[PDB]
Amino acid sequence: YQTERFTKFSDTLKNNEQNPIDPFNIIREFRSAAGQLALDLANSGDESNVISSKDWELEARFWHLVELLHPYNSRGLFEKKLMQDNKQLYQIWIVMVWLPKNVPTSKWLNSITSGGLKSCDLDFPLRENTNVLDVKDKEEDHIFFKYIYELILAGAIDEALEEAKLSDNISICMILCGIQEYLNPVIDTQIANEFNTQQGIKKHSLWRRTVYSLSQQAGLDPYERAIYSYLSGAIPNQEVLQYSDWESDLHIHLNQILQTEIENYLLENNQVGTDELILPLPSHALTVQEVLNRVASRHPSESEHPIRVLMASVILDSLPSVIHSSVEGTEASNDIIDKPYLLRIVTHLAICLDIINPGSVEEVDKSKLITTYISLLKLQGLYENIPIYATFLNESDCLEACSFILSSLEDPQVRKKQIETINFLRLPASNILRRTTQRIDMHLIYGVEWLIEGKLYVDAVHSIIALSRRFLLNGRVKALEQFMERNNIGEICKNYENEDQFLEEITQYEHLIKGIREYEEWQKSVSLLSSESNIPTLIEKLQGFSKDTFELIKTFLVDLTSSNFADSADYEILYEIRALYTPFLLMELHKKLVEAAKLLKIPKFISEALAFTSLVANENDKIYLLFQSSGKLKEYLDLVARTATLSN
Amino acid sequence: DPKFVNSLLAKLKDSKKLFQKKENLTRDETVSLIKKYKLISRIVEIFALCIYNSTDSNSEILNFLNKTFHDELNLKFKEKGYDIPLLDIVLKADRSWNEPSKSQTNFKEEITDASLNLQYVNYEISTAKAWGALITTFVKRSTVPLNDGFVDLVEHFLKLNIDFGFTQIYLERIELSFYILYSFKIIELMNKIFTIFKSGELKNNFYRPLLRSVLVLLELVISDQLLEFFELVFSKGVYLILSEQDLLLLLSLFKKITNVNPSKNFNVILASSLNEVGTLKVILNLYSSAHLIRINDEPILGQITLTFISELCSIEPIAAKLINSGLYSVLLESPLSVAIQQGDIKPEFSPRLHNIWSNGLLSIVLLLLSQFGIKVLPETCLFVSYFGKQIKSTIYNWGDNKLAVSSSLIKETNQLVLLQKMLNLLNYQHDKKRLSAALSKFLTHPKYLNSRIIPTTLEEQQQLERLEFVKGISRDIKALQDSLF
Fold first, then answer.
1. Does the entry feature the keyword Membrane, yes or no (chain A)?
2. B402 touching A, CB under 8 A?
3. Cα–Cα distance measured from residue B116 to residue B26, given in angstroms and rounded to the nearest whole number
4. What is the distance between the alpha carbons of residues B445 and A442, in angstroms, rounded to a whole number?
5. A180: which DSSP letter?
């Protein structure tokens, strides 16, 4: 459940804004969310929400667990070069390492008095009974060693030294200074400078095979020795277990894989000899994946946690193989459906990992996983994350599926994701855009809705009026109704007189149309009627009206002004309209006086199809440069003479 | 957050220099004071809550002397003060005993003052200029004779303007006075501009506090100060537009000059003082064709110069000071001949020149015939000749179908017919019948009426965003047809 978990991991992926990103942050945002979910149901809620919060504590841990000379040397520089010149062993070491008492000290009083003691040391304990000294520090060899077993997988041994020293031990704590290799200004040259004195043991391999004899010593009870196993590489002696789970096995496992193989490596560098053991050395190299099959069969109690399976696979370093088993699973089967965090958490990482390493996510397994997530979002009853996860979707799968999701229109930030699956999946004139009311330039009608909000409010009213004049020449005043109710309100300075000449550009277009229109009702009402009963005062006026409406007295069809926004296609377009329609009306106006029943507003007699000449000479529409100097203008003196004799 | 208020409920009324006698800006007395201006901070945050319930509703908002709001019987403008250095060359050998030890403590006390004045100043700023806010909201709430305690307090704060005469906090004594006699000061205070200001006009690169100040200083209820100050402002004020795009606040400060201690009937000496100087008659040329200063002629220039000649032509002497020195001039100096010489100035194509020729340029010349004009006679005949083409078109143009007309153009012909009427009466030493026919024709035809006349300018669309548009058109044709022969 926790649909708050989903929001908290889908915002990080992207407030879905576009900026440069380094996708390490998206792991950190994921960890920050994981801790806080893991708290908010781990102290309120029921108790199944404490297991839900236990799972999310695993998720945190795993996102923690992705991250984490030459010439003659001691054993110290060998070990450094080892870790230098491989990085799968260096990581293996980092895994096993990653996850208060008050004691007055002293002994040896009470021991001599009852019986024998005879020599002071905790080696008296080892010649015979471990009851021979004080028995409330026999207590401490169990108990403070138990604290030490939590500590060593919390890292370090010098931590464990400081607690060994409170354990009333002061010569059995020398064994934890023994674990140091020789670091010296006599035999190292880059460890001769952070130390100016001798450190560790240069018989560190005879130390290792002698602290390994104690790991099997049968006078030593398990609550001492289990750390002596571990100091020479960990045999699983059951008190290096305190968590006993999948990862507690694996730490002690991996400890022994490195501890066999360092002696081998030191047989190349020759720190192993025949004076360097009391017990013959295990020069068998140990394999990671096979000891994981031991672990896997041992704990089918951690096969139910898929996150614990994600944890395993990064130490394998086999990320495509897990990601391909968690979508279909294996091969066309359902078996990935029985953990409820499998299909979620491995979905999130498939996205975010593909941007880190793009061989690491197969990229087909991303595709299948976000589809699986989107169907489960369909069944959630969410529908404002089905956009967010179908950006990553492709036109091959879920074309029309996303069409019909994105049919409903909603919240501003969600419209930004809408656009980025609409025009991403290339659907512009399908059946998104009519299932908005029920439920190629169609989408320009629908693409002037997106501009009202900020950050594209400065580009808003600019593009609106552009798209008006683009499909006003083509023609579509029904659709011009839908750029003028999808019109941005603001266009002043604080949006950015600006744009308010366009208001009048529509109005001088109607002065042009009426002029074209009035030639129809001329052939009807004038030129087929030639009778009188007070009909002169009705048909002779109609002819006059059309003469008064075909030029704007100031200037017709010119604009270039400052109440117009910048562009020279607001000047040209008016010019191109002017030259195509202005001689069309002069051809119309010429037959309105020569073929009409009444030739003027006098039935006979003509003078005013010879005063067209003055009407091209006028600068009310400047029709003296709209007829070119020769071949048009010359032939036009022929034209009004031609029609002056068309009255006859 | 954190916020800059903090400490304690109102019920304390001091942080004077009276209680803590003038021994200040160096010592513990001042320290009580600066943390007292933290007090007054939280008290006036509390009084912001009283303005948010001035809006909503509250029992007896006014309360003086809710909470009482009188609590400063002096405001301090004393740190703008006290010199800190040049007690410190004495310091350079002092120390030998306990009279030195007294000395040395007074100068260490001023290394304390060096912190404390910075604090002080931020905090009296938060204090005082918000006290004024509170005062003003009390005034716009219903008047009481406790907003005359406002008179009692403002008076003590223009006499504590003087101690100097900085000036960018001097407004806590001007504009408070302004709310009093606006809803319903001190001659002395208002002299301060004629004292300080005078060193120029150019070197308005630090004159912005003076302008702010001056504005609200002009409020008084003629000033001899007024004639003097005026020779520099909006005589030589406006010169700088020929020494530059014309600018808002010149013509606005003119409006404040109009409203000051009586100038209403002194219109004669204002017009004279303006006429003597050659300016205020150079700017006319900008609308003609701007290039006097090499600023390229854009019709945006006209939009502001319009408001200028408008605010002039109201006042009949200031109107007349212009006709001779040439308006008939400016018309003849015209930039375009496709937009002032055609028969009807159309909203289509450039409604800039369309707003201009309607509002001004007709109503100005009419007013000049509203005096039962006897002076303007040849100039106005000449001006019917000039636009002879427009007189015959504005009659003729209309059929009973004539689209591409606006309410604006109707106004222009109201203007035009009104002018020809007065011209004929007022000399005392025709085809209008056409437009009477046309208008009846559209009257009896409501459909052609409503349809042909259409909105074009931005203004007009808002005239349909109640349909006050038609309302305008009715009262229009009333007066138009009344004046028409």
1. yes
2. yes
3. 8
4. 41
5. P
